[PDB]
Amino acid sequence: GTSKLKYVLQDARFFLIKSNNHENVSLAKAKGVWATLPVNEKKLNLAFRSARSVILIFSVRESGKFQGFARLSSESHHGGSPIHWVLGGVFKIDWICRRELPFTKSAHLTNPWNEHKPVKIGRDGQEIELECGTQLCLLFPPDESIDLYQVIHKM
Protein backbone atom coordinates (compact mmCIF):
# COMPACT_ATOMS: atom_id res chain seq x y z
CA GLY A 1 0.00 0.00 0.00
CA THR A 2 0.85 3.70 0.05
CA SER A 3 0.25 4.65 3.73
CA LYS A 4 3.94 4.36 4.62
CA LEU A 5 5.13 6.36 1.63
CA LYS A 6 2.50 9.06 2.19
CA TYR A 7 3.62 9.37 5.81
CA VAL A 8 7.23 9.88 4.70
CA LEU A 9 6.21 12.54 2.16
CA GLN A 10 3.85 14.52 4.40
CA ASP A 11 4.98 18.17 4.34
CA ALA A 12 8.16 17.23 2.42
CA ARG A 13 10.27 19.35 0.10
CA PHE A 14 11.24 17.96 -3.30
CA PHE A 15 14.24 18.68 -5.54
CA LEU A 16 15.01 17.55 -9.07
CA ILE A 17 18.56 16.18 -9.33
CA LYS A 18 20.08 16.09 -12.82
CA SER A 19 23.10 13.83 -13.34
CA ASN A 20 25.20 13.84 -16.49
CA ASN A 21 25.91 10.09 -16.40
CA HIS A 22 24.55 6.82 -15.08
CA GLU A 23 27.78 5.97 -13.22
CA ASN A 24 27.37 8.57 -10.47
CA VAL A 25 23.75 7.51 -9.91
CA SER A 26 24.85 3.88 -9.62
CA LEU A 27 27.52 4.90 -7.14
CA ALA A 28 24.97 6.90 -5.15
CA LYS A 29 22.32 4.15 -5.19
CA ALA A 30 24.70 1.60 -3.66
CA LYS A 31 26.43 3.87 -1.13
CA GLY A 32 23.57 6.19 -0.13
CA VAL A 33 25.43 9.45 -0.80
CA TRP A 34 25.08 12.50 -3.02
CA ALA A 35 27.13 15.60 -3.77
CA THR A 36 26.09 18.66 -5.77
CA LEU A 37 27.39 22.10 -6.68
CA PRO A 38 27.59 24.85 -4.03
CA VAL A 39 24.38 26.70 -4.95
CA ASN A 40 22.30 23.54 -4.64
CA GLU A 41 24.14 22.29 -1.53
CA LYS A 42 23.15 25.48 0.29
CA LYS A 43 19.52 25.09 -0.83
CA LEU A 44 19.41 21.46 0.26
CA ASN A 45 20.95 22.23 3.67
CA LEU A 46 18.34 24.93 4.26
CA ALA A 47 15.57 22.55 3.22
CA PHE A 48 16.87 19.85 5.57
CA ARG A 49 16.40 22.16 8.56
CA SER A 50 13.02 23.44 7.37
CA ALA A 51 11.06 20.29 6.42
CA ARG A 52 10.43 16.85 7.92
CA SER A 53 11.66 15.17 4.73
CA VAL A 54 13.75 16.42 1.85
CA ILE A 55 13.35 14.28 -1.25
CA LEU A 56 15.74 14.12 -4.20
CA ILE A 57 14.25 12.84 -7.46
CA PHE A 58 16.98 11.75 -9.89
CA SER A 59 17.10 11.99 -13.68
CA VAL A 60 20.12 11.23 -15.86
CA ARG A 61 20.40 13.81 -18.63
CA GLU A 62 19.21 12.57 -22.05
CA SER A 63 17.80 9.35 -20.56
CA GLY A 64 14.11 10.21 -20.82
CA LYS A 65 13.47 8.80 -17.34
CA PHE A 66 13.78 9.34 -13.64
CA GLN A 67 16.01 6.76 -11.99
CA GLY A 68 14.55 6.87 -8.48
CA PHE A 69 14.19 9.04 -5.39
CA ALA A 70 15.81 9.31 -1.98
CA ARG A 71 15.42 11.20 1.31
CA LEU A 72 18.20 13.23 2.92
CA SER A 73 19.25 11.76 6.24
CA SER A 74 21.80 14.52 6.93
CA GLU A 75 23.04 17.93 5.93
CA SER A 76 26.15 18.02 3.78
CA HIS A 77 29.45 17.23 5.47
CA HIS A 78 33.08 17.51 4.39
CA GLY A 79 36.14 15.61 5.54
CA GLY A 80 34.92 12.10 4.77
CA SER A 81 36.74 9.64 2.56
CA PRO A 82 36.74 10.99 -1.02
CA ILE A 83 34.07 9.64 -3.35
CA HIS A 84 35.58 9.00 -6.78
CA TRP A 85 32.66 10.44 -8.70
CA VAL A 86 33.11 10.39 -12.48
CA LEU A 87 32.95 14.18 -12.85
CA GLY A 88 30.55 20.52 -2.12
CA GLY A 89 30.01 18.31 0.90
CA VAL A 90 28.49 14.84 0.88
CA PHE A 91 24.84 14.27 1.79
CA LYS A 92 23.84 10.93 3.26
CA ILE A 93 20.60 9.73 1.65
CA ASP A 94 18.21 6.82 2.16
CA TRP A 95 16.77 5.58 -1.11
CA ILE A 96 13.00 5.08 -1.24
CA CYS A 97 12.84 3.84 -4.83
CA ARG A 98 15.70 2.81 -7.09
CA ARG A 99 13.42 1.79 -9.98
CA GLU A 100 12.95 3.86 -13.12
CA LEU A 101 9.92 5.93 -14.07
CA PRO A 102 9.80 6.99 -17.75
CA PHE A 103 8.81 10.56 -18.54
CA THR A 104 5.80 9.16 -20.44
CA LYS A 105 4.30 8.20 -17.09
CA SER A 106 4.60 11.74 -15.64
CA ALA A 107 3.34 13.69 -18.68
CA HIS A 108 0.21 14.89 -16.82
CA LEU A 109 2.17 16.47 -13.92
CA THR A 110 3.22 20.11 -14.06
CA ASN A 111 5.26 21.94 -11.43
CA PRO A 112 3.73 25.30 -10.36
CA TRP A 113 7.13 26.48 -9.04
CA ASN A 114 8.58 26.09 -12.57
CA GLU A 115 5.92 28.08 -14.50
CA HIS A 116 3.60 25.05 -14.67
CA LYS A 117 5.90 23.20 -17.07
CA PRO A 118 5.86 19.37 -17.09
CA VAL A 119 7.75 18.06 -14.06
CA LYS A 120 10.32 16.35 -16.34
CA ILE A 121 11.63 19.81 -17.32
CA GLY A 122 14.06 21.43 -14.93
CA ARG A 123 17.59 22.34 -13.99
CA ASP A 124 19.61 20.43 -11.41
CA GLY A 125 18.25 21.50 -8.03
CA GLN A 126 14.88 22.72 -9.34
CA GLU A 127 12.45 22.67 -6.44
CA ILE A 128 9.18 20.84 -7.08
CA GLU A 129 5.99 22.00 -5.29
CA LEU A 130 4.55 19.72 -2.57
CA GLU A 131 1.57 18.20 -4.36
CA CYS A 132 3.34 17.76 -7.69
CA GLY A 133 6.34 16.17 -5.96
CA THR A 134 4.09 13.89 -3.90
CA GLN A 135 2.15 12.67 -6.94
CA LEU A 136 5.40 12.21 -8.87
CA CYS A 137 6.84 9.99 -6.12
CA LEU A 138 3.59 8.00 -5.95
CA LEU A 139 3.95 7.12 -9.65
CA PHE A 140 7.11 5.06 -9.08
CA PRO A 141 6.73 1.27 -8.84
CA PRO A 142 7.29 -0.51 -5.52
CA ASP A 143 10.91 -1.40 -4.86
CA GLU A 144 11.28 -4.70 -3.10
CA SER A 145 14.96 -4.05 -2.42
CA ILE A 146 13.92 -1.19 -0.11
CA ASP A 147 12.61 -1.29 3.46
CA LEU A 148 11.02 2.00 4.55
CA TYR A 149 11.47 0.98 8.20
CA GLN A 150 14.78 2.82 8.67
CA VAL A 151 13.44 6.07 7.20
CA ILE A 152 10.27 6.01 9.30
CA HIS A 153 12.35 5.71 12.49
CA LYS A 154 14.80 8.46 11.47
CA MET A 155 11.96 10.98 11.09
For every residue of the chain, DSSP letters joined together read --HHHHHHHTT-EEEEEEES-HHHHHHHHHHTEEE--HHHHHHHHHHHHHSS-EEEEEEETTSSEE-EEEEE-S--B-SSPPP------EEEEEEEE-S-EEGGGSTT-EEGGGTTEETT---TT-EE-HHHHHHHHHTSPP-TT--THHHHHH-
The coordinates were experimentally obtained by X-ray
**Resolution of the structure in the document, Å:** 1.4
Return all residues near 121 (Cβ < 8 A) that are at least 6 apart: 114
Q: How far apart are CA 125 and CA 39, in angstroms?
A: 9
Structural domain span for residue 91: 1-155
Phi, psi of 145 (to 5 degrees): -80, -5
Task: Evaluate whether 117 touches 108 at the Cβ level (below 8 Å).
Answer: no
The one-letter amino acid at 87: L
Residue 60 β-bridge partners: 19
Number of domains composing the chain? 1
